[PDB]
């Protein structure tokens, strides 16, 4: 194989959304390939998958859902800003079902087949029915503030929906659920006040689980599941002190993953949760405690559907690119495109007063001495491990010993875990990676000690900009989607009136708070920061404006600190938004051009 | 039928009154109607008629006559230099560029298009004269046209830090003077090779007015001795669209005629090399905004608080702009407060009647300018409509003396503060017509600062506007294309340090917000450099975060957008949530 | 509310039958909605479905079988050969326009112009100029064996010549020099046929089926004095009608024939002799395929809309989506010296005396009958008796009835349709004899010209395409080298033939005109310019004549072409809103 560069990843085909046929036997799914990603609908009976569309302008096609005989596919088409198309699978091409200016969202058959809801501004978004069997649309419902989760009984009598029901409860990312029966007016069904997403009727038609917290817990809690009945609500997956869903790190998921819990039979709930870095998926049972049903620990389950007769899903892990699945089949051949050969991590240990907390390191190929980057994942509540990361494949194929850890804060080792990071970052995350770096030091001699780097995104921005301003020894920093100055961080992000609310117990316009904020900001230390910098942003960034990044390219300049600022046009994970790779190659072209010239 | 901010589409603005060489005539640019478009005008003494006239793009600017009158040089709106024959005949296209400037014998027309080029006009060619790495800032020819004189940093970081040197370029550049401060209005001395320019010494910060400084052979001596005040108009008023040139120049070998700021009005002086500064042409009632001279005439415009800027020619104005102000002007009376500096004044314009009104105290930018005479359309229609404005020049104010700007060094929101509280108890005081119960307070840049601190340090306001308002003065250090420099100059701090931060937070009024009670408008370009809007955003989210009625109005234009295009969307639309807030809350 | 032109838009039309190989299916071409976009439709017996579902452009066209009946080729739009697997999945886009797509029959190739003729590989899916003509490609038909396509080429006076085109890795094959289409090889790879009429004859000689072997030629639907093809009016086809003949077996070949106002399909038998195949002498076989397996058509009446059908069985639906009630027409007779001459008669509903539309047919050698033509449905409808008849010169009934007006228009098919409009009147009480008008197209647009300039009896008429000066039109008609010389027998470029033409010529008459007239062209007409309108428009005009010229910027049959109806509604409402003011 050939020398790779960011290159490397045109050679990839991106899988997303596996959708399982309702006789089980059958997955459609979503696959972005090869310049521009446009995506296509594939589908398998369970040998290789053959593509079923293909798209030569716009997005491409997205979203496959079944019908409930199995005979039709309803899709997304962009090509036509996202119109709602109906395919016959034995034969024939799509009819396009709407003609909306702006297209629509999240397609849902009712399980009897006679309608098709979804989402569309028209000319916040409504709610509207597609009828079947007339050929008619209607509009359903027109929220005051926006829909969230949807999902229809399962006698299709109607549909459960997640709303704030005014700009007062929606100011405090608060929600409630509703019945809303089909049109010939929704009325409530729990007092929640709370966040909520991943409706999933219960088969007796009246119960139902979400996914969330209940109102009393702040949104560094675990999101749980929970059992409603009559307005009443019990946590359901009792004895499993993870989060659902997939909060792993990885830079392979283009498109829409699913992760909807399904009911497999009156008792039995199939979900997904992350466990130490990975993701697996689980059972909770109405009559008792969560059970594994698909879990390895070395490996992330990113999407998922399901139902009483048959799975299907996407697997990767930190050494393989995703693939799909069905029934335990793989059904594409998607790793294969790799372009160079992936090697496997080594886990090094650290120590913490809650117990130990891990980390990797990737080497590259030799035995001579490389330099050793410390790479931070952002969140800070979510983990690495083993989700698959072409950027880290990358760096140690091109000669970096990749270090990457979970520090206190990460959300795969408990709530306690979590919650040790809470209204003191800086303090006993900065110690574990730090710790941890050292223990990569220690336990890799080949890692070289005088060319180490620090780098992240996000919360790993927040992080690099303190550590460097905590510590001159590194030789290189590379600061993504930074955080340096709290205080003014409330007032522009989108987010800013919550997160720090959540994250630190902190508010910005009260003064004593302020001053909090402001000790906790890396910018009050950067008259410290002797460490070139490469700091990269979008220029629209919505929730972390660049005047993050505008204020630490300023002072370092200042002090006449080597610093350089790449200023993006597009903004974050422009991949998944619209197929364009350029933001993703210029970003790791600038990477390894600012470490090739400090390490 | 009160007016409204319509009233200003009824105005047309004069700019840039350029004095023939023979002294007889003078040309100008006037911006009419919507969208504003300027031409060129003349006036051989009298009325002053059109000479060119626009219906596509900004228009006509720059006009500069040929040493041997007989052509007039202007851009035209790209931006080409066009050449007009003043005896008849159309306009050639020469020819975007700025800042054309003849060489004193004719031969030559040197421009910026950045990097300086030259036209040579006996031969019709063009020519690039010198590319500069970071940029060329004033530029004045010797008066035998050898070359120019040209200001410019010796890197990105010495431009930040405002350092400047002065150079000599020949015709098709050799350092001339060691200044590494600030720099601009060279004025060549007729014997050729002495030069004045404005500017301060290397010593000095920013805050100390802007000075008249000889330059022989390296060495610098003050020109403008015995006068404490600075060169050049730094008074408000709203009617300047356009360009309005302020180079000093030589009437004779002895005497440079220049501008200067004193106790918020504007007038011409001059500079002699044997002595102190003379006045040559100063009501301290009005404001001289623009001149042209040489040594056969003057040329120049002229306003006051209750008159609409004109243009002058000897003495003798050529316009009749102030006929078209469409609602009758106010006088203002004068209201003063002491100060441990001395005593302070401001002023209060009235409406018609013998009613209560409302009282508006406005805070004058800067904050190094003063209030006072300048013609402001915005203050005769808050009047027209029904308000008291108050407005005032506290301590930091920039005509009264280097210790008033001093006074507030390091510690913005204190004394100034102070003032300006103090000033509008005076006002009320003064004036029974104003009525306490219904006050608002509001102002722009350095004034939305102030209006940011003074709703957070008292609740006695009943609604408050606050335009590109500064907040959080630490991430301005970091956002604003000024913030490498601006608190070092102001305050002696740097927020790049962490004990100069902490202070610049005990500065900010964010630190105080959570005391807001007033219902508060802010005003805001989207696109703000100077003044980025991060700025607002931290006010309009804590305001909101408190409850506190507030709106917030976000500009997609940049201020001075007349000026910039002659769209008066923003001016429009400003006035319109200023005044429709003020009605909401009174 | 009586209805209008509008009633056009309920239509849906059916075009290009195409019957599987294995002659058990048939994709075929649907053009409906304002601006008709057609789609590929396919049935397997029953009721068709929709294979595609064009939004923007004319839409999709040509549906080709693969030989294996697992693949349809088609064309969508500029216009991209595309190739439709049937068992699943949406097309693939082959090309980057094109037309005339056709498979070779062992499967390998699908040959297209794009004009030039191109070549596509289908198992190396690669593309391939095969022949550029000098002049252009006519006909084109594989050889049974792939070996390559037979070909005709020249041109102005339309004659042409076979050609064989083997495979590149073309010769002359006949010296026909005359009008040549439809050509059909024989399966045994060797023989072929064609639809023409040889040298010596004229052009107003029927077409006719003959088998050629070694360069020499046999007349095949011989005892059998009609022409082959659809030649009978109506104007509901949008889209390709195929018509081409085909070898149901080694002795026998299917091709479609005009006789008297219907079209029919019969077998002609090598050694000669014509058997009817499928003929109802009241109704409209528009269009066929067919193989050793299966036939498929489209069939129509005076009656009822164009259906489809497979093997006998309708498969479409399209009559019932016809918006208002239709109505039989009444069959009139009339006598000539060559025998009964024949016409229709079509009434509004009611017992009231109507307004007597009397209706000519173009051509002049096409027939009136059994086609079905919604602007007569819908002038009944809104209280018209349409009178429409098939003169002397008309193709249906002999060679003879062709040739009877042979150099001499404005005789004895004058008479037939004054005399038939005579009988009309007698025989039909309701028709009221005080409010009549003449109409028609093309010759008819000549014919209505030619009457209105020797008669004053009709109210109203209307002369759509017009012919008013013969010498003119020689010269300035894209046909007008040959036309006058085939029809006539007369050159407009030597002068004694030109003053007999002028003789013919209506405008010569124009100063008998009192008829308040309509006039309906198409400003780009090639083949009847302008200039024809232009003229009889200014003579009424000086003579002050009530006359309205409505200039279409969009050429004849511009809904057929592009889908557009805006030309054939706003005829229409010309059409109505004259006879309003007139009746």
């Given at each position: 194989?050939?020398?790779?560069?960011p290159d490397s990843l045109?050679?990839?085909?991106?899988?997303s959304?596996?959708?399982v046929?309702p006789?089980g036997?059958?997955?459609?799914f979503?696959?972005?390939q090869?310049?521009?990603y446009?995506?296509?609908?594939?589908?398998?009976?369970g040998?290789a998958?053959?593509?079923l569309?293909?798209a030569e302008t716009?997005?491409?096609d997205?979203?496959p859902?079944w019908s409930?005989?199995?005979?039709?596919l309803?899709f997304?088409r962009?090509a036509v800003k996202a119109?709602?198309?109906l395919?016959?699978?034995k034969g024939?091409?799509?009819?396009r079902?709407?003609?909306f200016?702006?297209?629509v969202?999240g397609?849902?058959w009712s399980?009897?087949?006679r309608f098709?809801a979804?989402t569309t501004?028209?000319?916040?978004?409504?709610?509207w029915?597609?009828d079947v069997?007339?050929?008619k649309?209607?509009?359903w419902?027109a929220?005051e503030?926006g829909?969230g989760?949807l999902?229809?009984?399962?006698?299709?009598?109607g549909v459960?929906?997640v709303?704030?029901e005014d700009e007062?409860?929606?100011?405090?990312w608060?929600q409630?659920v509703?019945?809303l029966?089909l049109?010939?007016?929704?009325?409530?069904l729990?007092d929640?006040?709370?966040?909520?997403?991943?409706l999933a009727?219960?088969p007796?038609?009246q119960?139902?689980a979400?996914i969330?917290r209940?109102?009393?817990?702040g949104?560094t809690e675990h999101?749980?599941?929970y059992l409603?009945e009559?307005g009443?609500?019990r946590?359901l997956?009792?004895g499993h002190?993870?989060?659902?869903g997939?909060?792993?790190?990885?830079d392979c998921?283009v498109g829409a993953?699913?992760?909807?819990?399904?009911?497999?039979?009156g008792?039995?709930?199939?979900?997904?949760?992350?466990?130490?870095?990975s993701?697996?998926l689980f059972?909770?049972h109405?009559?008792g405690?969560?059970?594994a049903?698909?879990?390895?620990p070395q490996?992330?389950?990113?999407?998922?559907t399901?139902?009483?007769?048959?799975v299907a899903?996407?697997?990767?892990s930190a050494?393989?690119?995703?693939?799909?699945?069905l029934?335990?089949?793989?059904?594409?051949?998607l790793?294969?495109?790799?372009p160079?050969?992936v090697?496997?991590?080594?886990?090094?240990?650290f120590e913490?007063?809650?117990?130990?907390?891990?980390?990797?390191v990737l080497?590259?190929?030799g035995?001579?001495?490389?330099?050793?980057?410390?790479?931070?994942?952002?969140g800070?509540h979510?983990d690495?491990?083993?989700?698959?990361?072409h950027?880290?494949?990358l760096m140690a194929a091109?000669?970096?010993g990749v270090?990457?850890?979970?520090?206190?804060?990460?959300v795969?080792y408990?709530?306690?875990?979590?919650?040790?990071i809470?209204?003191?970052?800086?303090?006993v995350?900065?110690d574990?990676?730090?710790?941890?770096?050292?223990?990569?030091?220690?336990a890799?001699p080949?890692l070289?000690?005088?060319?180490?780097?620090?780098m992240?995104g996000?919360?790993?921005?927040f992080?690099?900009?303190?550590i460097?301003?905590?510590?001159?020894r590194?030789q290189?920093?590379?600061?993504?989607?930074c955080?340096?100055n709290?205080?003014?961080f409330?007032g522009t992000?989108?987010?800013?009136?919550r997160?720090?609310?959540?994250e630190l117990?902190?508010?910005?316009?009260?003064?004593a708070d302020?001053?909090?904020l402001w000790?906790?900001?890396?910018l009050?230390?950067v008259?410290?920061?002797k460490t070139?910098?490469?700091?990269v942003?979008?220029?629209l960034?919505h929730?972390?404006?660049?005047?993050?990044?505008?204020?630490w390219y300023?002072?370092?300049?200042?002090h006449q600190?080597?610093?350089?600022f790449v200023?993006?046009?597009?903004?974050n994970?422009?991949?998944?938004?619209?197929?364009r790779?350029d933001?993703r190659?210029?970003r790791?072209?600038?990477?390894?051009?600012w470490?090739e010239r400090?390490?």
């Open positions: 194989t050939p020398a790779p560069g045109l050679a990839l085909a991106f899988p959304d596996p959708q046929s006789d036997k059958q997955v459609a979503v696959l972005a090869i310049p521009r446009r995506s296509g609908l594939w589908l398998s009976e040998g998958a053959r593509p569309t293909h716009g997005r491409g997205s979203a859902r409930p005989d199995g005979q039709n309803a997304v962009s119109a709602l198309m395919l016959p699978l024939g091409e799509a009819r079902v709407t003609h200016k702006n297209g969202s397609p849902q399980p009897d087949g098709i979804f501004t028209a000319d916040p978004a409504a709610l029915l597609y069997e007339a050929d649309l209607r509009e419902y929220p503030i829909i989760a999902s229809w009984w399962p006698d299709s009598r459960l929906i709303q704030s007062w409860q929606a100011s405090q608060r409630d509703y019945d029966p049109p010939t007016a929704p009325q409530k729990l929640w006040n709370s966040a909520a997403h991943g009727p219960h007796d038609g119960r139902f979400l969330g209940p109102a009393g817990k949104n999101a749980h599941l409603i009559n009443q609500h946590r997956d009792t002190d993870h989060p659902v997939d909060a792993v790190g990885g998921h993953f699913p992760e909807g819990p399904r009911w497999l039979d008792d039995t709930l199939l979900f997904s949760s992350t466990v130490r870095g993701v697996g059972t909770a109405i009559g405690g969560v059970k049903y698909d879990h390895d490996g992330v389950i990113s999407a998922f399901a139902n009483e007769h048959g899903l996407i697997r990767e050494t393989r690119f995703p693939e799909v699945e029934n335990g089949q793989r059904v594409t051949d790793h294969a495109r790799f160079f050969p090697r496997e991590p080594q886990r090094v240990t913490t007063e809650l117990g130990e907390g891990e980390g990797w080497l590259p190929e035995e001579q001495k490389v330099p050793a980057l410390l790479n931070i994942h952002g800070p979510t690495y491990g083993h989700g698959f990361t950027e880290f494949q091109r000669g970096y270090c990457y850890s979970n520090p206190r804060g990460s795969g408990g709530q306690a875990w979590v919650d040790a809470y209204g003191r970052w800086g303090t995350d900065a574990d990676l730090l710790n941890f770096f050292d223990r990569c030091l220690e890799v080949r070289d000690a005088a060319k180490t780097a620090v992240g996000s919360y790993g921005g992080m690099t900009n303190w460097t301003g905590h510590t001159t590194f290189a920093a590379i600061t993504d989607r955080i340096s709290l205080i003014s409330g992000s989108d987010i800013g009136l997160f720090w609310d959540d117990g902190l508010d910005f316009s009260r003064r302020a001053l909090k000790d906790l900001s890396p009050q230390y008259e410290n920061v070139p910098t490469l700091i942003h979008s220029v960034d929730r972390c404006p660049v005047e993050q990044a505008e204020q300023a002072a370092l300049h200042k600190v080597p610093v350089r200023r993006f046009p597009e903004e994970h422009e991949l998944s938004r619209s197929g790779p933001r190659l210029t790791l072209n600038e990477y390894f051009a470490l400090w390490l």
